[PDB]
Design a protein around this ligand. Structure first.
Ligand code: CL
Ligand code: CL
Ligand code: CL
Ligand code: CL
Lengths: 109, 112
């Protein structure tokens, strides 16, 4: 499932990054590391004297599962992946405390 | 050109790998080396849990944009910009992205 899950995570993150309307002073970054399987959508820049430096969504792929590590949106990218064909057991909520995961409807490592 | 881009890619990856191999984090915290050589984004992050406390932080981040190395984040008490210089990177080809735009032309380094 590695190639399949790489393609799905890349597609979702690309959708979000391509739809991000941050102004000219904030760079929208898409970060795809296919060797260590770390995938991110970032905002990096400035609004006046305020530093904007934030990962909006982060997914890893580790041992056959997709790990959601960060979600700053009001949306549910884990369910979006499900809606796109990833079974819930193959999603790990990394951004949730480990002890909770076996009681969630998603997977464990 | 291309020799200069690859030079800078290698130097950034070597420094970050250097930085990350000195990590002191717990076994419950991963050290992530996030290296995108197609889009030229390079990070060292710590990702995990300390008890019920979420660890999610980028210790250093470099981009390479139009052939210049941008330092975007540095939570260490090291000076990665100076290290790159000591490694052969011209000052003028380093941009302090972590400094406000208006200041960059007045730093020791460079601008876009
Ligand atoms: Cl900027
Ligand atoms: Cl890694
Ligand atoms: Cl951070
Ligand atoms: Cl600049």
């Amino acid at each position: 499932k590695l190639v399949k899950y790489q393609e799905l995570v890349k597609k979702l993150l690309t959708n979000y990054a391509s739809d991000d309307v941050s102004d000219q002073d904030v760079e929208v970054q898409l970060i795809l590391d296919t060797e260590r399987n770390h995938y991110q959508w970032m905002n990096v820049g400035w609004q006046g004297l305020n530093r904007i430096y934030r990962c909006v969504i982060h997914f890893d792929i580790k041992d056959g599962k997709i790990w959601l590590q960060q979600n700053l949106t009001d949306r549910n990218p884990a369910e979006e992946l499900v809606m796109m064909g990833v079974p819930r057991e193959d999603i790990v909520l990394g951004l949730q405390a480990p002890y909770k995961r076996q009681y969630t409807d998603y997977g464990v490592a």
